[PDB]
Amino acid sequence: DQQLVDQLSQLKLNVKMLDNRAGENGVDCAALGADWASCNRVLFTLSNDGQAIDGKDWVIYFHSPRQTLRVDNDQFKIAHLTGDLYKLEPTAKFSGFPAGKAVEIPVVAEYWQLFRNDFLPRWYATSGDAKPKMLANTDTENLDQFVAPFTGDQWKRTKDDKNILMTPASRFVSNADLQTLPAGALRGKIVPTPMQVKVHAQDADLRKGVALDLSTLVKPAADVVSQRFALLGVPVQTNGYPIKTDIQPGKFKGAMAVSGAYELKIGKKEAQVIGFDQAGVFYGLQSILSLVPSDGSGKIATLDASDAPRFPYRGIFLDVARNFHKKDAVLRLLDQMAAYKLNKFHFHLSDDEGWRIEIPGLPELTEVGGQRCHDLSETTCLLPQYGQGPDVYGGFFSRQDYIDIIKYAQARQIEVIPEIDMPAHARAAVVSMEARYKKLHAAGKEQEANEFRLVDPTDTSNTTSVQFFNRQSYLNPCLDSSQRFVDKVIGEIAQMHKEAGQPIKTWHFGGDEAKNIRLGAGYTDKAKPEPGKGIIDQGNEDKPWAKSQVCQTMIKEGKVADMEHLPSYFGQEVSKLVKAHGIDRMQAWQDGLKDAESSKAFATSRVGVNFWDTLYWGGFDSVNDWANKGYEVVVSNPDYVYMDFPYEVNPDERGYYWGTRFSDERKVFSFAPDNMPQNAETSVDRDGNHFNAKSDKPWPGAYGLSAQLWSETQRTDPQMEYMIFPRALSVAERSWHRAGWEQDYRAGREYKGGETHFVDTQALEKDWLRFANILGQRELAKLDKGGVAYRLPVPGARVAGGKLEANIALPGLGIEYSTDGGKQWQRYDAKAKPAVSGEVQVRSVSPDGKRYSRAEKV
Numbered sequence: 064d065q066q067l068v069d070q071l072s073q074l075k076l077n078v079k080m081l082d083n084r085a086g087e088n089g090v091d092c093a094a095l096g097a098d099w100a101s102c103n104r105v106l107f108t109l110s111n112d113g114q115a116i117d118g119k120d121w122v123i124y125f126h127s128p129r130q131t132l133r134v135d136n137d138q139f140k141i142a143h144l145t146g147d148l149y150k151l152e153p154t155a156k157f158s159g160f161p162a163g164k165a166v167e168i169p170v171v172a173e174y175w176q177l178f179r180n181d182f183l184p185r186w187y188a189t190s191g192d193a194k195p196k197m198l199a200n201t202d203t204e205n206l207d208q209f210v211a212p213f214t215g216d217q218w219k220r221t222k223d224d225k226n227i228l229m230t231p232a233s234r235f236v237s238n239a240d241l242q243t244l245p246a247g248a249l250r251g252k253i254v255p256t257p258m259q260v261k262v263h264a265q266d267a268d269l270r271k272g273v274a275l276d277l278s279t280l281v282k283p284a285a286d287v288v289s290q291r292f293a294l295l296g297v298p299v300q301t302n303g304y305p306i307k308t309d310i311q312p313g314k315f316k317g318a319m320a321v322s323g324a325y326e327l328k329i330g331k332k333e334a335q336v337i338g339f340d341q342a343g344v345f346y347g348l349q350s351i352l353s354l355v356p357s358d359g360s361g362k363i364a365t366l367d368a369s370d371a372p373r374f375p376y377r378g379i380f381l382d383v384a385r386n387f388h389k390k391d392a393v394l395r396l397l398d399q400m401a402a403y404k405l406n407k408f409h410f411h412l413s414d415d416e417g418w419r420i421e422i423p424g425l426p427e428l429t430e431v432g433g434q435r436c437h438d439l440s441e442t443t444c445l446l447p448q449y450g451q452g453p454d455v456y457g458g459f460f461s462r463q464d465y466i467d468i469i470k471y472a473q474a475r476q477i478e479v480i481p482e483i484d485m486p487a488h489a490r491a492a493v494v495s496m497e498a499r500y501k502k503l504h505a506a507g508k509e510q511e512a513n514e515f516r517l518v519d520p521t522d523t524s525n526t527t528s529v530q531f532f533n534r535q536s537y538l539n540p541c542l543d544s545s546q547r548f549v550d551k552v553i554g555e556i557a558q559m560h561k562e563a564g565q566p567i568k569t570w571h572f573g574g575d576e577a578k579n580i581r582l583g584a585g586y587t588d589k590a591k592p593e594p595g596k597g598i599i600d601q602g603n604e605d606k607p608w609a610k611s612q613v614c615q616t617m618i619k620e621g622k623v624a625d626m627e628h629l630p631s632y633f634g635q636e637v638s639k640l641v642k643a644h645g646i647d648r649m650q651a652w653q654d655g656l657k658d659a660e661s662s663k664a665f666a667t668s669r670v671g672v673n674f675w676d677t678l679y680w681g682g683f684d685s686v687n688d689w690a691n692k693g694y695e696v697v698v699s700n701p702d703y704v705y706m707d708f709p710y711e712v713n714p715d716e717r718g719y720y721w722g723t724r725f726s727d728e729r730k731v732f733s734f735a736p737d738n739m740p741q742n743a744e745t746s747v748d749r750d751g752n753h754f755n756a757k758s759d760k761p762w763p764g765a766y767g768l769s770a771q772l773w774s775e776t777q778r779t780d781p782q783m784e785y786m787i788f789p790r791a792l793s794v795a796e797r798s799w800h801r802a803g804w805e806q807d808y809r810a811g812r813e814y815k816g817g818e819t820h821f822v823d824t825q826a827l828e829k830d831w832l833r834f835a836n837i838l839g840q841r842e843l844a845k846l847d848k849g850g851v852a853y854r855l856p857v858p859g860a861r862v863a864g865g866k867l868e869a870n871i872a873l874p875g876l877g878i879e880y881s882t883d884g885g886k887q888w889q890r891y892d893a894k895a896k897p898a899v900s901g902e903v904q905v906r907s908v909s910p911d912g913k914r915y916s917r918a919e920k921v
């Protein structure tokens with residue numbers, strides 16, 4: 064009843080990691096069905112400061128990205144609902160939560176939990192009648208309230224983990240090659256780095272303002288430029304420094320004769336931008352804006368530059384489905400993109416856990432798919448996921464919101480690429496279309512009910528998705544209703560784009576992870592168990608759609624060869640729908656198109672793939688095959704440009720970490736996307752080990768670069784911003800500019816981490832030192848002004864010769880120290896180091912002085 068829920072709500076949870084490598088320490092993880100026989104032991108403690116809780120009519124719901132495999136307190140049991148939602152229940156042996164005591168529940172989970180961010184907030188209790196209530200101490204974004212600190216070697220994945228734990232003292236060493244450059248060395252430095260620049264000794268004076276000739280630009284675009292000058296403190300007034308613009312396509316030849324190319328001349332009396340096109344003028348204007356200092360000085364170097372993008376596709380991907388991100392945050396993101404010349408916004412509008420775009424005629428997609436709540440019937444909501452509580456959590460962009468975002472992007476020279484992920488990652492859509500089916504079926508409108516249905520009612524396939532959903536995550540590719548649904552959604556989104564004035568140029572099909580994970584390599588069958596694998600019953604495990612009658616008749620009429628070719632076949636069918644709507648380019652995650660013969664199998668004349676295989680695992684060689692089959696390769700490797708991954712190896716950092724353990728501003732910058740094998744000399748793998756890389760195949764080159772923000776643990780907009788910035792500035796650099804240390808691809812060259820020395824790592828180093836300095840001394844102050852809650856790096860620090868020595872990953876940022884427990888903070892001066900004794904803490908501070916990094920002890 065309610066009373067029981069009220070009592071349970073007052074239980075205080077504490078989560079403590081016991082062992083991240085339980086399989087190495089006597090637990091038989093294989094017998095528990097753990098992938099690759101890997102499991103961890105965690106302790107859940109529930110403390111009661113009230114009277115005894117003796118009822119048994121309750122369920123406690125919690126979220127985890129890890130499956131619970133064993134419960135070591137026999138008074139309780141844990142069962143999976145779907146996705147990340149689990150239930151804790153009392154067994155027949157439960158004898159109550161005693162008054163004033165703690166109950167301990169040790170559990171065994173699959174894999175490892177290396178970051179405290181792995182533990183999700185907002186556990187909740189239910190009981191019969193009653194309205195669900197959260198366990199109040201867990202209703203927070205601060206994990207310190209319920210998750211204990213990691214100690215010792217608990218951050219290690221295996222006993223052989225070679226990653227380096229980052230503390231102030233080891234971080235001091237990783238930053239020791241950095242130094243603060245004098246302001247003179249940063250004069251005339253545009254970033255992204257221009258293709259060619261000659262900096263002269265005179266400076267132009269922008270203090271009385273600039274007089275802009277934006278006649279070449281459509282109004283909305285000219286207004287973006289004018290607002291940005293004003294933001295950075297240069298008033299716009301007619302008597303100011305003249306900046307002239309013109310478009311002249313004929314002055315550009317060969318490979319500089321591309322959209323976004325420009326010639327820039329900054330003089331003492333005036334400036335002139337000549338673009339190949341409007342993007343080119345807009346971009347030459349953003350290059351002047353990049354020189355404006357963060358010191359109030361109003362001076363910029365005179366210079367002559369000529370520039371053009373190395374790639375036509377320079378993208379940022381955003382997931383709004385896992386956790387919604389508001390219109391205001393999307394706009395801020397687009398502002399910053401435009402400032403650093405990023406031009407493609409890949410918008411992931413749907414997935415299992417949410418559907419975020421209003422579709423005229425299919426209201427259930429947003430009414431149901433657009434919100435999560437504790438509704439076991441899933442008629443009004445999708446089940447709760449990702450630690451957002453049991454009550455309604457959600458949002459979506461209305462048709463007008465969406466049109467607004469597209470217009471906003473268009474002014475900023477950014478192309479909006481909508482992604483509606485299929486045929487896996489489609490639970491919001493499938494469940495919403497089921498609620499639609501039920502509603503219409505009840506009114507006796509059976510043809511209407513079935514019109515956009517995404518389920519074959521005969522399908523009993525037993526399949527587990529990557530995120531542990533079942534067959535409801537997989538839209539059925541063989542149904543005529545599924546094609547109707549696809550056609551209708553493409554149609555409606557295409558109309559919004561037409562109204563916004565930016566007609567869709569690329570449809571993103573999705574296509575990722577359309578498989579059953581129980582049939583993967585790390586699991587083994589109960590009957591002939593291979594050692595070191597998760598022992599499960601694999602004889603009742605099906606490939607997706609295996610038991611669909613409709614898919615079976617499709618296979619027998621000869622339309623497709625096997626169940627395995629379904630995803631690729633569906634990609635080919637959707638390309639025909641995309642083409643029919645006037646769209647001549649489709650893009651997909653490469654694994655959904657793997658069984659297609661080549662780009663020729665598609666109806667669009669262009670087919671792009673987001674290439675998301677990790678490099679250290681073979682990506683440096685398998686990427687070639689896509690480019691050579693006609694696909695435009697959009698480099699999206701998780702080991703370098705997944706922005707949902709942690710900035711550093713520290714258990715208190717935010718992020719997922721399946722593809723690598725960290726990717727900081729420096730690592731992202733060091734990525735060489737057009738000569739994949741070379742990264743073997745400049746990076747380490749997910750366990751910190753050196754790797755080797757070689758390809759013997761032809762490499763025509765990549766078409767683009769994209770950095771991804773997946774949103775599982777990015778629950779708020781500030782969290783999203785913490786993960787994207789400032790490392791997306793490194794992405795902008797590398798997607799625009801090819802550095803001298805980025806060598807040409809050579810078939811047969813084998814790069815061996817720690818052994819070969821092909822790459823000019825001293826040039827790489829010098830390039831990074833300058834770039835890190837531009838961020839710390841100029842650009843971060845601009846992000847402050849754009850309202851972006853970027854991550855402030857924690858300082859490196861050591862105590863030497865009686866004084867505190869501190870450093871930082873982005874030289875120029877302020878550093879503070881405290882010698883009294885973090886009560887009083889003082890500013891660090893490198894040229895008058897402070898004498899120190901006992902405990903010191905350090906923290907960094909934003910340029911505007913309002914935000915601080917986390918504080919750490921030396």
Ligand SMILES: CC(=O)N[C@@H]1[C@@H](O)[C@H](O[C@@H]2O[C@H](CO)[C@@H](O)[C@H](O)[C@H]2NC(C)=O)[C@@H](CO)O[C@H]1O
Pocket residue numbers: 128529575576652675705707719720721773774775
């Ligand atoms: C708990 C965990 O780490 N799971 C991993 C999945 O998240 C991951 O899926 C892919 O990665 C993204 C997160 O970085 C997902 O949001 C996304 O849906 C998915 N697909 C794409 C194209 O990235 C997979 C990758 O094999 O591994 C898991 O272990």
